[PDB]
Paper text:
Nitrogenase provides access to bioessential nitrogen via the reduction of highly inert atmospheric dinitrogen (N2) to ammonia (NH3). In all nitrogenase isozymes, H-subunits form a homodimeric reductase component (‘HH’) that transiently associates with and transfers electrons to a catalytic core. This catalytic component is a heterotetramer composed of two D- and two K-subunits (‘DDKK’ or α2β2) and contains the active site metallocluster where N2 is bound and reduced to NH3.
[name] and Anc1B are the same age, whereas Anc2 is reconstructed from an older phylogenetic node. As an additional distinction, [name] and Anc2 contain an ancestral D-subunit protein complexed with WT H- and K-subunit proteins. In addition, all ancestral proteins crystallized in space group P 212121, which differs from the space groups for the same proteins in [name] NifDK (i.e., WT; space group P 21), Clostridium pasteurianum Nif (space group P 21), and Klebsiella pneumoniae NifDK (space group C 2). All three ancestors showed anisotropic diffraction: 2.65–2.93 Å for [name], 1.82–2.8 Å for Anc1B, and 1.82–2.42 Å for Anc2. Global structural differences between the ancestors and WT [name] DDKK are relatively minor and within the range of variation for available extant structures. Among the two hybrid ancestors, the RMSD between Anc2 and WT (0.24 Å) is smaller than that between [name] and WT (0.31 Å). Notably, a non-conserved Nif-D α-helix (positions 165–174 in Anc1B) lies within interacting distance of HH. This helix contains several substitutions across all ancestors, albeit the positioning of polar amino acids differs among [name], Anc1B, and Anc2. Herein, the D-subunit S165A substitution is consistently present across all ancestors and may influence interactions with HH S175 in the ATP-bound complex, potentially reducing stability.
Residue numbers in the entry:
A (entry chain D), C (entry chain B): 2 to 523
B (entry chain C), D (entry chain A): 5 to 481
The structure:
């Protein structure tokens, strides 16, 4: 039943007695549900150190992964290019998901197409699809470029993109001059971030490889910036801001900040901004090339050092204080430009905020997950703050990366209780936060079910999620934040401290019980 | 008029090459309500054109996402590379009551996570081991499904063998499903495969077990996946009408309920597209009739209630009228508050396989007018049922493209559009109120009398929101 | 008792049985405490419509005000001037508090002095103090200027600042040329904001009144900006940013953003940035003068229109969409500069965010308090979003202002259930949120006790506080936010929607109870 | 060296005019531990120099903020203009247990909120009506205080008359206090006034009431305002020593407890500065002795415990040693963990009237060294007790200025400073670890054995925080 002056949605509609009674009868009548006490027994069990030992002996089953396919990262990469249409060779089901996934994170349209390969292509291969696809795509959406990725299906049947693209040109499905860079993006290797790397190197080789004779390092007096898989718009913008502020010439390669933040003005803009084709062709002439996320830009790096002969600096992601410092100083060295007073002041303000907030941050224990670069950046910053990163998880990490993180932990007293987990999933993490309870989790929206679970055991066992990462679907507009540089450091610091104080308020809010400590001034 | 639409189509169709233009003219038509057979107007359930940015998904979405995933007490394995499972994880609001992680698993993602090893050498051994790990770590599961992603068939794995063998080892129902993305043209075949998997592996479990106490008032809700609790707001009305809802498929559904469904007297089918196959099966084998119903808006909820009650004695028919009388002042208040605010407004819909015709009645009950509708994966028997629902010379579009949908909207200039997440933020930039007709815009339920209130509120909040009057800057005038 | 490996602070230390037992014995032994049943009875009573009727019939007693003294605003005003020392004539106790109050909000040093008047000054007046004070102050802290305010003591004694300052010059306690603007700031009139207005007009008259012969409106080709009492650093910065972006010459008069955000680099900077003396002297030559907070700049406006002959535009605070629009268009008109594409796009992005978030914001009911301009800005913006401002309270508001807000409410369908309260306090508000429960409160840290109170009645009656205003003492670094312009609009929108979603998560987090609606995607 | 300090002082003192330089040289001194009389080295409790940015507050802070406001079951009216009450509202962490708004009122702000009307015409009538409104809206209050702000005396209001008259009307203790900001030179007189108000209006209430059951072990904690629960971590030790703490003044204190204090056997005074006045009074009238104690760090907590136990029989003395023995392994562990990390480090303190000498013992117990200390409003009998506490030729400063405190720090270069909120963010910018020694940096308690653990942890966390090694940019070197 509904009162019209206060209409109820699913919640709290279904809390009405009529509904509660119905669901009781459904359960008892037909569901043949285990008894509540059996359920409580098993739930208690899943929180034990015993269950964890079994959990961590898994070898086949993955539960609640914290990673995605290669092609996802390929799409995001391609979207950073001017009037470029991401195009994925294979099954159309993939593109439906890719678009949705990004739709929900960015709350923006996301343009991408498929070959729509079917059963016929299993036997005969996907040549005809590529031809008709490339043609139709170009005709219908008027891209200036089409960046080709693969679904697993295409990879397994062993389609040759290079041959398939060329035959499309040869047979007059696409103009010969029309730019169609490509990359193999098998979902059964690496992760979304590996897809970004493969696409990007696919695009950089298309515009440069053949035309390297006239190229001269330094001629354009700029620095190339490769950002990698980035889902915070503040991160593209902050880097641009800091380089402008330094008076450094730069070229941001794969720059989607405009197309994922078009205004609502009465027009639909399918394409907007992006790295130009000429920016790519001229890229070899840059002083140097800097990779913001080195741990997923391994193939890109090999090509830049290898073919463009740029001495790619050994730089960590510019997260936190030390790695933003090191980033800025490298650029100063490469560019000849001094670090300006405005950035020295910004730095000073971050440090001021650290001094202002240290008492609450000190010794707080955290579990965190995400992509390797992000995660290690976060770890580093937590250690600068005096926090304890207790459970560090990277589903798409490796022993080399792990070793690099273990080194960072070893260099700090705050890393004594830290442990790094690669190839593990949020079901593994769930265990860790029950047996070795932190204060908070930092990670993506998938961490809300862990919080749900920890509450179920009791309020004193609840581990609150702080949403930093990707995807974030259950909050609005957090995709607009910054995690890089001093600005990103300041936003994170604020989120961490205020998450601590928010929770402390919640615990002290009980009247004549815990409110002795509900201080006005923290 | 008809010729105003017929040349709208031709204008939009100019963008395409010769081969593509021929395909799409068949999938675009003005509505003719006097027509009996929809094949004269439009074609449907054909291959998508490569590179035209279809809104369609795959068979795995139809199987795992739609049919199977909603069953709470079963564990559903996304068998293949990590991906399909991640994007489908809790993407669909098929609501349920359970202790997630313990006795229900709907919003979790179980997957084999194929690497190269497993593509090269096949993942039959990995699948076997994986099932053993589930049984250890998730003892309260009452069954397992295996949802094949694209590679499984391509590498020639025998998941049927593993399922049988591990099924007898652990004494658990393990259902293999060949819902590989590349099969079929859309979600639609995924449904059909999923349906057939239920038949073959689950439904016959209590053929020789009549220990369950039956009544002449037993029914099953078939093809209601309980988006935002739609099935619950449906169920409550049926049990208030004096019926017994023995099973729901598959929103808040369970295996015991699926096994019990062959014991009911009538199958009440909400979604024909997804679940007609298994309904027909139960009519063949078990002799159970089935009828289509519709709980969108008062007009249809009432029609449906009475049409159902008429399949029983006059006791149900009486209870039916008590029910309709109970809710008359509730929906009448809704129409009082909102119809004034929505009267005359024009809508364009694009959804999957059902809702393009079903929701029409609800709009008409708030004095709105659907002028454009289309299905993603709908068949010609879906268009047969849309004919009389839609107005004369309104716009029909099967498997509409990104280009086509946008171009159409610009000429039609609707007050509101109802579609999915990929189309959402496009039309919000053009300044056109948008409601999601899959996820309900994270609202609902929209079924029944309790849902109609929410539906009305939601259309009003969006169509008459102050944000829409602000898109143009005062100076750019 | 303490375990050294996990030391406990007040919370949760005093939840140990030994302590609980001790406090029970303290209570029963010596406190002669009312019975818990009596307490619960009275608590229940304070939540009733009956108690509210009594509450609202108050005439003498004020409980939990939402306002401060004049001199507070005077200090904040003065701090916006270059190498200026705020100096307050009267009792030193006042300055101790003023400094603390700001210290806790900004987490920065706050410089201010007193002439330390005592009982002797009640009889003989505070002449000698002013003389020695001005001398000592200048000698010790080397200000370029000293801005003089009053404490209530001095006001009641009837000290004449003008005479006292002049005699200090006449008797050689300070140089004659040394600038010592002043203003009467009686705490028993208006509020902190009235103090800002009086000080500012005090400063503007000092540098212009006598030197007005050579002045010519428009000579500058600039716009004066008077900001008023502002405690968000983003608000000073956003206006500066938007004017630069427009290519408009501007003069921000009272600009403390630098001195309340000095870096931590190893130096203490007592003074930093600020409106220059020359900027003040040249101010009359501006095209025009714009007041950001007109409802507390009544005296300033009379002086600007009156003496500088600037046609001050009738502009509301630039909060939200319509009033940022109107602000930018006025500046365009005054300055001759077109509104640039970057700001047209920023506008478009805010509108995008409104379209993206409208479903959650629609119909949410709010109680809010603060200073008049801020409050009405907030109200306006809530109405643009489709929210219902149910309880609008301004302790330091007036009938003219109330009428202006009632007009705004009347112009919108979302103002149907709104009510405006002037001269009321947070104890009045407490009643309102019990009898006519909103979804949230928006206001300063003092609203946490109201939240505490509403929870005590039950979880379904809890009204969560969203902290926007001043002071904010129980969170860190929120003083860095923006409330003005499109930027401020976007920060608020994000805060409001995510406050709704955070609370919705909390309500849906109960397993097999309400978690049917714990959706991944919002 | 003494001469290295004596010319440090003269260097800092150069900035001042002739008149100011003379005043401040009296208020700045090297410490001489062999001296008996502090008037030979330093002067104190004199008027502040105008315009030198003293850290001092007023008599109202001493009365309302320190002494009276902590009493939970009384309502304290800030009588005058709106501000003083607003800035003092919940500014001080005097902890308590109650239902705030119902039976306890500590963190609330009650005020008369004077306008011009009330300055011109006086607020005696307003105060009267105000008290009636309290009695209606706050029936469970057990008493009322009236804290005079600056105007009250200046306009010649008779709050004594109103208090008496309304006191007899409602049958409640209503206490008028003349704590007007302009009286005295600091918080110190505010205390004295507040103390005298208690005597005159509260303490004698049970002179002819001996119904209260007494023991030989009854005591009162006098001058512990329970910052962060300091009084509680103090009390628990006294009750474990077999004493009965009949009253606390005024942290978590109550009116009944103040009234009961003349029945105790001994007054245990933590803060001499604030509450020696009333202690002396009770020795005169009621014959109750009193002694100073100190529960900062093990060394003093032990000394104090034993010194107190010695005032009773051998039963207490025994219980004392049980207590000491119970907590020995706890504080020993604290010293084990932290002393290593803090050994050798140098501190400068500046607080109000007590803590500049009291906390020294706690620092020395973690191997630290206080090299600079000063009081805001302390008297010469406070410096008398600081003499032997501080090292030889360490730095003493009464009513230190902003300039002086900064300049001193630059030459001394301490590892840590302990002071108030106004000094906090100054020294954090210079790169010098800072702890608040009023509010405890929103931590605590720091008293007792349970407090010492927290104290140690807090000093370590701040002094060795990683933030401090990062202040200078790598490039600007
Ligand atoms: S009462 Fe005094 S200034 Fe003895 S006015 Fe002050 S809560 Fe200080 S050194 Mo703040 S004489 Fe208490 C004090 Fe000491 S407010 Fe507290 S810390 S022990
Ligand atoms: S059509 Fe459908 S969604 Fe596509 S794969 Fe095939 S079942 Fe799945 Fe999967 S991991 Fe990624 S999204 Fe694909 S490349 Fe493979
Ligand atoms: S020394 Fe002390 S705090 Fe000062 S007034 Fe006097 S009692 Fe009070 Fe009050 S309202 Fe403002 S802060 Fe002052 S000018 Fe009056
Ligand atoms: Mg958006
Ligand atoms: Mg600071």
């Amino acid at each position: 039943s509904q009162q019209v002056d206060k209409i109820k949605a699913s919640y709290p509609l279904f809390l009405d007695q009529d509904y509660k009674d119905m669901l009781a009868k459904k359960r008892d009548g037909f569901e043949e549900k285990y008894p509540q006490d059996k359920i409580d027994e098993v739930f208690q069990w899943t929180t034990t150190k015993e269950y964890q030992e079994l959990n961590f002996q898994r070898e086949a089953l993955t539960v609640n992964p914290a990673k995605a396919c290669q092609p996802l990262g390929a799409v995001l990469c391609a979207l950073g290019f001017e009037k470029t249409m991401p195009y994925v060779h294979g099954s159309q089901g993939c593109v439906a998901y890719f678009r949705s996934y990004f739709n929900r994170h960015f709350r923006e349209p996301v343009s991408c197409v498929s070959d729509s390969m079917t059963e016929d292509a299993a036997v005969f291969g996907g040549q005809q699809n590529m031809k008709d696809g490339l043609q139709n795509c170009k005709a219908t959406y008027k891209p200036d470029m089409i960046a080709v990725s693969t679904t697993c299906m295409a990879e397994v049947i062993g389609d040759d993109l290079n041959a398939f693209i060329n035959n499309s040109k040869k047979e007059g499905f696409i103009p010969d001059e029309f730019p169609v860079p490509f990359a193999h993006t098998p979902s059964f290797v690496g992760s979304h971030v590996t897809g970004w790397d493969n696409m990007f190197e696919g695009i950089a080789r298309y515009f440069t490889l053949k035309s390297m004779d006239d190229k001269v390092v330094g001629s354009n007096k700029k620095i190339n910036i490769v950002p990698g898989f980035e889902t915070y718009l503040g991160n593209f913008r902050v880097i641009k801001r800091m380089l402008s502020e330094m008076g450094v010439g730069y070229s941001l390669l794969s720059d989607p900040e405009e197309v994922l933040d078009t205004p609502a003005d009465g027009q639909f803009r399918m394409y907007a901004g992006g790295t130009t084709q000429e920016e790519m062709k001229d890229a070899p002439n840059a002083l140097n090339t800097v990779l913001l996320q080195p741990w997923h830009l391994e193939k890109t790096k090999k090509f830049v050092e290898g073919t463009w002969k740029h001495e790619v600096p050994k730089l960590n992601i510019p997260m936190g204080l030390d790695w933003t410092d090191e980033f800025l100083m490298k650029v100063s060295e490469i560019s000849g430009q001094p670090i300006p007073a405005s950035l020295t002041k910004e730095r000073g303000r971050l440090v001021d905020m650290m001094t202002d907030s240290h008492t609450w941050l000190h010794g707080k224990r955290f579990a965190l997950w995400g992509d390797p670069d992000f995660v290690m950046g976060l770890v580093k910053f937590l250690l600068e703050l005096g926090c304890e990163p207790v459970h560090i998880l990277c589903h798409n990490g490796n022993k080399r990366w792990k070793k690099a993180v273990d080194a960072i932990l070893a260099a700090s007293p705050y890393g004594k209780n830290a442990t790094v987990y690669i190839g593990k999933d949020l079901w593994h993490l769930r265990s860790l936060v029950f047996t070795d309870k932190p204060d908070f989790m930092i990670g993506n929206s998938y961490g809300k079910f862990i919080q749900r679970d920890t509450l179920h055991k009791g309020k004193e066992f609840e581990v609150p999620l702080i949403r930093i990462g990707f995807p974030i679907f259950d909050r609005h507009h957090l995709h607009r934040s910054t995690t890089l540089g001093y600005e990103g450091a300041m936003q994170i610091l604020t989120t961490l401290v205020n998450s601590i104080l928010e929770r402390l308020d919640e615990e002290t809010r009980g009247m004549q019980a815990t409110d002795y400590n509900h201080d006005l001034v923290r | 008029s008809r010729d105003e639409v017929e040349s709208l189509i031709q204008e939009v169709l100019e963008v395409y090459p010769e081969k593509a233009k021929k395909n799409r003219e068949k999938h675009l038509s003005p509505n003719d309500p006097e027509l009996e057979q929809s094949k004269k107007c439009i074609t449907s359930n054909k291959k998508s054109l490569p590179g035209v940015m279809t809104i369609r998904g795959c068979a795995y979405a139809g199987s795992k996402g739609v049919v199977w995933g909603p069953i709470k007490d079963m564990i559903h394995i996304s068998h293949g590379p990590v991906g399909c499972g991640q994007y489908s994880r809790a993407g669909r609001r098929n609501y349920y009551i359970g202790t997630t992680g313990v006795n229900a698993f709907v919003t979790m993602n179980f997957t084999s996570d194929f690497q190269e090893k497993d593509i090269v050498f096949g993942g039959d051994k990995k699948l076997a081991k994986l099932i053993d790990e589930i049984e250890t770590l998730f003892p309260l599961n009452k069954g397992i499904s295996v949802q094949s992603e694209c590679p499984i068939g391509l590498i020639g794995d025998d998941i049927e063998a593993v399922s049988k063998q591990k099924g007898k080892e652990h004494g658990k129902t393990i259902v293999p499903v060949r819902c590989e993305g590349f099969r079929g043209v859309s979600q639609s075949l995924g449904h059909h495969i999923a349906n057939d998997a239920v038949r073959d592996w689950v439904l016959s479990a209590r053929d020789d077990d009549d220990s369950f106490e039956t009544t002449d008032y037993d029914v099953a809700i078939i093809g209601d996946y309980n988006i935002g609790g739609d099935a619950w707001s449906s169920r409550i009305l049926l049990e208030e009408m004096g019926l017994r809802v023995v099973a729901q498929w598959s929103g808040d559904g369970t295996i015991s309920e699926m096994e019990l469904t062959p014991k009911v007297k009538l199958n009440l089918v909400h979604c024909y597209r997804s679940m007609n196959y298994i309904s027909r099966h139960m009519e063949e084998k078990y002799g159970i009739p089935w009828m289509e119903y519709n709980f969108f808006g008062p007009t249809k909820t009432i029609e449906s209630l009475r049409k159902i009650a008429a399949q029983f004695d006059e006791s149900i028919q009486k209870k039916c009228e008590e029910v309709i009388a109970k809710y008359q002042p509730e929906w009448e208040a809704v129409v009082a508050k909102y119809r004034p605010r929505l009267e005359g407004k024009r809508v364009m819909l694009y959804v999957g396989g059902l809702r393009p015709r079903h929701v029409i009645g609800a709009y008409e009950d708030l004095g709105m007018e659907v002028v454009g509708t289309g299905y993603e994966f709908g068949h010609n028997d879906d268009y047969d049922r849309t004919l009389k629902e839609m107005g004369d010379s309104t716009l029909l579009y099967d498997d509409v493209t990104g280009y086509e949908f946008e171009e159409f909207v610009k000429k039609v200039k609707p007050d509101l559009i109802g579609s999915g997440i990929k189309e959402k933020y496009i039309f919000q930039k053009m300044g056109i109120p948008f409601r999601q007709m899959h996820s309900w815009d994270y609202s609902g339920p929209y079924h029944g009398f309790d849902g109609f209130a929410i539906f009305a509120r939601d259309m009003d909040m969006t169509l008459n929101n102050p944000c829409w009057k602000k898109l143009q800057a005062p100076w750019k005038k």
